[PDB]
Coordinates of C-alpha atoms and ligand atoms in Angstrom, one line a residue:
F46 CA 78.7 80.3 25.8
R47 CA 78.5 79.7 22.0
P48 CA 80.4 82.5 20.2
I49 CA 78.1 83.9 17.4
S50 CA 80.1 87.0 16.3
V51 CA 83.4 89.0 16.7
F52 CA 84.5 92.3 15.3
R53 CA 87.0 95.2 15.7
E54 CA 86.6 99.0 15.2
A55 CA 86.4 99.7 11.4
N56 CA 89.4 101.4 9.6
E57 CA 91.6 101.5 12.8
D58 CA 95.0 99.7 13.0
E59 CA 94.4 100.2 16.8
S60 CA 90.8 99.1 17.6
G61 CA 89.6 101.2 20.6
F62 CA 86.3 99.9 21.8
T63 CA 86.0 100.7 25.7
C64 CA 82.3 100.0 26.5
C65 CA 79.0 98.6 24.9
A66 CA 75.2 98.4 25.3
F67 CA 72.5 97.0 23.0
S68 CA 70.5 99.8 21.2
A69 CA 66.6 99.8 21.5
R70 CA 67.0 98.8 17.8
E71 CA 67.3 95.0 17.5
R72 CA 70.5 93.7 15.8
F73 CA 72.6 96.9 16.7
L74 CA 75.2 97.4 19.5
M75 CA 76.3 100.9 20.7
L76 CA 80.1 101.2 21.6
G77 CA 82.2 104.0 23.1
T78 CA 85.8 104.4 22.0
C79 CA 89.1 105.6 23.5
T80 CA 88.8 108.8 21.1
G81 CA 85.4 109.6 22.7
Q82 CA 83.3 108.4 19.7
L83 CA 79.9 106.7 19.8
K84 CA 79.5 104.0 17.2
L85 CA 76.5 101.9 16.1
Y86 CA 77.5 98.5 14.8
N87 CA 75.5 95.7 13.3
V88 CA 76.3 93.1 16.1
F89 CA 76.1 90.0 13.6
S90 CA 77.8 91.5 10.4
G91 CA 80.3 93.8 12.4
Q92 CA 79.3 96.7 10.0
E93 CA 79.8 100.2 11.3
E94 CA 76.4 102.1 10.6
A95 CA 77.0 105.5 12.4
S96 CA 79.7 107.5 14.3
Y97 CA 79.5 110.7 16.4
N98 CA 82.2 112.5 18.5
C99 CA 80.7 112.8 22.0
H100 CA 84.0 113.7 23.9
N101 CA 87.6 114.6 23.3
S102 CA 88.7 111.9 25.9
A103 CA 87.9 108.2 26.2
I104 CA 84.3 106.9 26.8
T105 CA 84.1 105.1 30.3
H106 CA 80.3 104.4 30.3
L107 CA 77.2 104.7 28.2
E108 CA 73.4 103.9 28.8
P109 CA 70.7 104.1 26.1
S110 CA 67.1 104.9 27.2
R111 CA 64.5 102.0 26.6
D112 CA 62.3 104.1 24.2
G113 CA 65.4 104.7 21.9
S114 CA 65.3 108.6 22.1
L115 CA 68.1 109.4 24.7
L116 CA 71.7 108.4 25.5
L117 CA 74.0 109.0 28.6
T118 CA 77.8 109.1 28.2
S119 CA 80.8 109.5 30.6
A120 CA 84.3 110.4 29.5
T121 CA 87.7 110.4 31.4
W122 CA 89.2 114.0 31.5
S123 CA 86.7 116.1 29.5
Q124 CA 84.7 119.2 30.6
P125 CA 81.9 118.4 30.6
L126 CA 82.7 114.9 32.0
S127 CA 79.2 113.4 31.3
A128 CA 76.3 114.3 28.9
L129 CA 72.7 113.5 27.7
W130 CA 72.2 113.1 23.9
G131 CA 69.0 113.1 21.8
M132 CA 68.9 110.5 19.0
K133 CA 65.5 111.4 17.4
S134 CA 66.4 112.4 13.7
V135 CA 69.5 114.5 14.5
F136 CA 72.1 113.2 17.1
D137 CA 72.5 116.3 19.5
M138 CA 73.6 117.3 23.0
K139 CA 70.5 117.8 25.3
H140 CA 72.3 118.6 28.7
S141 CA 75.8 118.2 30.2
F142 CA 76.9 117.3 33.8
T143 CA 80.1 119.2 34.3
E144 CA 82.0 117.2 36.9
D145 CA 79.9 113.9 37.3
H146 CA 82.2 111.0 36.4
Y147 CA 79.2 108.5 36.1
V148 CA 75.5 108.8 35.2
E149 CA 72.5 106.4 34.9
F150 CA 68.7 106.8 34.0
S151 CA 66.1 106.1 36.7
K152 CA 64.6 102.7 36.0
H153 CA 60.8 102.6 36.4
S154 CA 59.9 106.0 34.8
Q155 CA 63.0 107.2 32.8
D156 CA 62.3 110.9 33.5
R157 CA 65.5 111.5 35.6
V158 CA 69.3 111.1 35.6
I159 CA 71.5 110.3 38.6
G160 CA 75.1 111.4 38.4
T161 CA 78.0 110.8 40.8
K162 CA 80.8 113.2 41.7
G163 CA 83.2 111.5 44.2
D164 CA 81.2 110.8 47.4
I165 CA 78.2 113.0 46.1
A166 CA 75.0 111.9 44.2
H167 CA 73.1 114.5 42.0
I168 CA 69.6 113.9 40.6
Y169 CA 68.5 115.8 37.5
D170 CA 65.1 116.5 35.6
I171 CA 65.6 115.3 31.9
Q172 CA 63.3 117.9 30.4
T173 CA 64.8 121.0 32.2
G174 CA 68.3 119.5 33.0
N175 CA 67.8 121.1 36.5
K176 CA 69.4 119.6 39.6
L177 CA 66.6 118.5 42.0
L178 CA 68.6 116.9 44.8
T179 CA 72.1 116.5 46.2
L180 CA 72.4 113.3 48.4
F181 CA 75.5 113.5 50.6
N182 CA 76.2 113.2 54.4
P183 CA 79.9 113.6 55.4
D184 CA 79.3 111.6 58.7
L185 CA 77.9 108.5 56.9
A186 CA 80.3 108.4 53.9
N187 CA 82.4 105.3 53.2
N188 CA 84.6 107.2 50.5
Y189 CA 84.4 104.2 48.0
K190 CA 87.0 104.9 45.3
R191 CA 84.6 103.6 42.5
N192 CA 81.4 105.0 43.9
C193 CA 78.5 104.7 41.4
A194 CA 75.1 106.1 42.6
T195 CA 72.0 104.1 41.4
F196 CA 68.2 104.1 41.7
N197 CA 66.4 101.0 42.8
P198 CA 63.8 99.5 40.3
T199 CA 60.9 101.7 41.5
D200 CA 63.0 105.0 41.6
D201 CA 62.0 105.6 45.3
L202 CA 65.4 104.6 46.8
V203 CA 69.1 105.5 45.9
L204 CA 72.3 103.7 46.9
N205 CA 75.1 106.2 47.1
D206 CA 78.6 105.5 48.6
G207 CA 77.1 102.5 50.6
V208 CA 74.2 104.7 52.0
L209 CA 70.6 103.7 51.3
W210 CA 68.5 107.0 50.7
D211 CA 64.8 107.6 50.6
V212 CA 64.3 110.0 47.6
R213 CA 60.9 111.7 48.6
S214 CA 62.2 112.6 52.1
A215 CA 65.8 113.1 51.0
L216 CA 66.9 111.2 54.2
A217 CA 69.5 108.5 54.7
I218 CA 67.7 105.4 56.1
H219 CA 70.8 103.0 56.6
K220 CA 74.6 103.1 56.2
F221 CA 76.0 99.7 55.2
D222 CA 79.5 99.1 56.8
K223 CA 82.6 99.3 54.6
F224 CA 84.3 95.9 53.9
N225 CA 86.3 96.9 50.7
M226 CA 87.9 100.0 49.3
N227 CA 86.3 100.2 45.8
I228 CA 82.8 98.8 45.1
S229 CA 79.7 100.7 46.4
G230 CA 77.0 98.3 45.2
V231 CA 73.8 97.8 43.1
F232 CA 70.1 96.9 43.7
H233 CA 69.1 93.4 42.7
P234 CA 66.2 93.8 40.1
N235 CA 63.8 92.0 42.7
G236 CA 63.8 95.2 44.8
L237 CA 64.6 93.1 48.0
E238 CA 68.4 92.8 48.1
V239 CA 71.5 95.0 47.7
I240 CA 74.8 93.5 46.4
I241 CA 77.8 95.4 47.8
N242 CA 81.1 93.7 46.7
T243 CA 81.0 90.1 48.4
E244 CA 78.0 91.0 50.8
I245 CA 74.3 90.4 49.9
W246 CA 72.1 92.4 52.3
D247 CA 68.3 92.1 53.0
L248 CA 66.5 95.5 52.6
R249 CA 63.9 94.5 55.3
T250 CA 66.3 93.6 58.2
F251 CA 69.7 94.8 57.0
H252 CA 70.9 91.2 57.8
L253 CA 73.7 89.6 55.7
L254 CA 71.9 86.8 53.5
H255 CA 75.0 85.5 51.5
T256 CA 78.8 85.8 51.4
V257 CA 80.1 85.4 47.7
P258 CA 83.9 85.6 47.8
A259 CA 84.1 85.3 43.9
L260 CA 82.3 88.7 43.6
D261 CA 85.3 90.5 45.1
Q262 CA 86.1 93.7 43.1
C263 CA 83.5 92.7 40.4
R264 CA 81.2 94.9 38.3
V265 CA 77.9 93.0 38.2
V266 CA 75.3 92.9 35.3
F267 CA 71.9 91.0 35.3
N268 CA 70.1 89.5 32.3
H269 CA 66.7 91.2 31.6
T270 CA 64.5 88.7 33.6
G271 CA 67.1 89.0 36.5
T272 CA 67.6 85.2 36.9
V273 CA 71.4 85.2 35.9
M274 CA 74.2 87.6 37.2
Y275 CA 77.5 88.2 35.4
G276 CA 80.7 89.6 37.2
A277 CA 84.0 90.8 35.8
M278 CA 86.8 91.5 38.3
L279 CA 88.8 94.9 38.4
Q280 CA 92.6 94.9 37.8
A281 CA 94.8 95.3 41.0
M292 CA 94.7 102.2 27.9
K293 CA 94.9 100.1 31.1
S294 CA 92.0 97.5 31.1
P295 CA 89.6 98.2 33.9
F296 CA 89.0 94.3 34.5
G297 CA 91.1 91.0 34.2
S298 CA 90.7 88.2 31.7
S299 CA 87.8 86.2 33.4
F300 CA 84.1 86.6 34.0
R301 CA 81.9 84.6 36.5
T302 CA 78.2 83.8 36.1
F303 CA 75.8 83.2 39.1
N304 CA 72.2 82.0 39.5
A305 CA 70.6 85.3 40.7
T306 CA 68.0 83.6 43.1
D307 CA 70.6 81.5 45.3
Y308 CA 74.1 83.0 44.2
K309 CA 75.5 79.5 43.3
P310 CA 78.1 79.6 40.5
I311 CA 77.1 78.4 37.0
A312 CA 80.4 79.1 35.1
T313 CA 83.9 80.6 35.3
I314 CA 85.1 81.7 31.8
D315 CA 88.7 82.8 31.1
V316 CA 88.7 84.4 27.6
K317 CA 92.5 84.9 28.3
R318 CA 92.3 88.7 27.3
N319 CA 91.5 91.7 29.7
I320 CA 87.8 92.7 29.7
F321 CA 86.7 96.4 29.2
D322 CA 82.9 95.8 29.5
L323 CA 80.0 93.2 29.2
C324 CA 76.2 93.7 28.6
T325 CA 72.9 91.7 28.0
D326 CA 70.2 92.2 25.3
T327 CA 66.5 92.7 26.4
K328 CA 65.5 89.0 25.6
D329 CA 68.1 87.1 27.7
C330 CA 69.7 85.7 24.4
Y331 CA 73.1 87.3 24.2
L332 CA 76.1 88.5 26.2
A333 CA 78.5 91.0 24.4
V334 CA 82.0 91.4 25.9
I335 CA 84.8 93.9 25.0
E336 CA 88.2 92.1 25.2
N337 CA 91.7 93.6 24.7
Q338 CA 94.1 91.5 22.4
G339 CA 97.0 93.8 23.6
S340 CA 98.7 93.8 27.1
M341 CA 98.5 97.1 29.3
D342 CA 102.3 97.6 28.4
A343 CA 101.5 97.7 24.6
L344 CA 102.0 101.0 22.6
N345 CA 98.2 100.9 22.0
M346 CA 94.9 99.2 22.7
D347 CA 93.5 96.4 20.4
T348 CA 90.0 95.5 21.6
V349 CA 87.4 93.3 19.9
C350 CA 83.7 92.9 20.7
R351 CA 82.5 89.2 21.0
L352 CA 78.8 88.1 21.0
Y353 CA 78.0 84.9 22.9
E354 CA 74.7 82.9 22.7
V355 CA 73.8 82.0 26.4
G356 CA 70.1 80.9 26.1
Ligands
LQH1 F1 85.1 100.8 36.4 C1 83.8 101.3 36.2 C2 83.0 101.5 37.3 C3 81.7 102.0 37.1 C4 81.2 102.4 35.8 C5 82.1 102.3 34.7 C6 83.4 101.7 34.9 C7 84.3 101.6 33.7 C8 85.5 102.2 33.7 C9 86.4 102.1 32.5 C10 87.7 102.7 32.5 C11 88.4 102.6 31.3 C12 87.9 102.0 30.1 C13 86.6 101.5 30.1 C14 85.8 101.5 31.3 C15 84.4 101.0 31.5 N1 83.7 100.5 30.5 C16 82.5 100.1 31.0 C17 82.7 100.1 32.6 N2 83.8 100.9 32.6
LQH2 F1 62.9 97.2 57.9 C1 63.3 98.5 57.9 C2 63.7 99.0 59.2 C3 64.1 100.3 59.2 C4 64.1 101.1 58.1 C5 63.8 100.6 56.8 C6 63.3 99.2 56.7 C7 62.9 98.7 55.4 C8 63.5 99.2 54.3 C9 63.1 98.7 52.9 C10 63.7 99.2 51.7 C11 63.3 98.6 50.5 C12 62.5 97.5 50.4 C13 61.9 97.0 51.6 C14 62.3 97.6 52.8 C15 61.7 97.1 54.2 N1 61.0 96.1 54.3 C16 60.6 95.9 55.7 C17 61.2 97.1 56.4 N2 62.0 97.7 55.3

């Protein structure tokens, strides 16, 4: 993990980066801030290129669309809580998702959003904004405190609150048992496995394949090719993770590295070419008057 670049929010005695994601434009990182701003930075020079006020509370999440035309955001205590922005010529609000605390794009064909409200997953048409599906069954719920609904890599299955759902039928096909209070899980990119906290489940048999105790309370991100997996552990403003990230071989779940940066982590994300990891670190402690985050850029391959 060769450090390539570091930078703080321009013209701020208190740097307030809270999340990041590479833009579809090579060389440029998108960051959310604690004042609800979207910033475009050159990742190598640290130069601020653009700024827009998306929300009047802190950004918690953002996801750019792979064609470079759309952007999802989620805030903290804003109504609306999440939104979809156009970035073709003018930066403008397309649609808002009043109470959804988290949103993603579909993966294969990026023609939907999926948004999460507590235990309840909402699927929307991007062109109309219209709500096509509510996926929720009160008898199968796990009530995960950090539930994040997500599409599989072909868009035909949804994981919501530890329940696998067929989309076309709008039926629940399997409830994974609850083994932690917080993490609800993600699809591997290979379409065959589900990662729910420390449990890796087969999608063909619903058997446990692997136990990975190091993944406990981690948010997980894959490289583009899906051969490497990075995890940063939640804490037991306030930094959402601790000071260390783990990296795993994505095909057998054997550890490659444990990095302590010695500074609490807000986010981490991968470029499209499996070259870089970008990490938001806080230089302050939680007790500090204010935040002081940087972005670091690491060569990996
Ligand atoms: F915890 C989460 C679970 C699922 C999705 C997003 C988050 C999250 C919460 C958060 C809270 C305060 C400041 C920054 C963040 C943040 N930045 C990127 C990830 N993230
Ligand atoms: F096996 C099952 C028994 C009962 C209900 C469903 C399944 C199942 C779900 C699935 C989901 C995503 C990818 C592959 C699969 C799969 N492969 C074999 C069977 N199977």
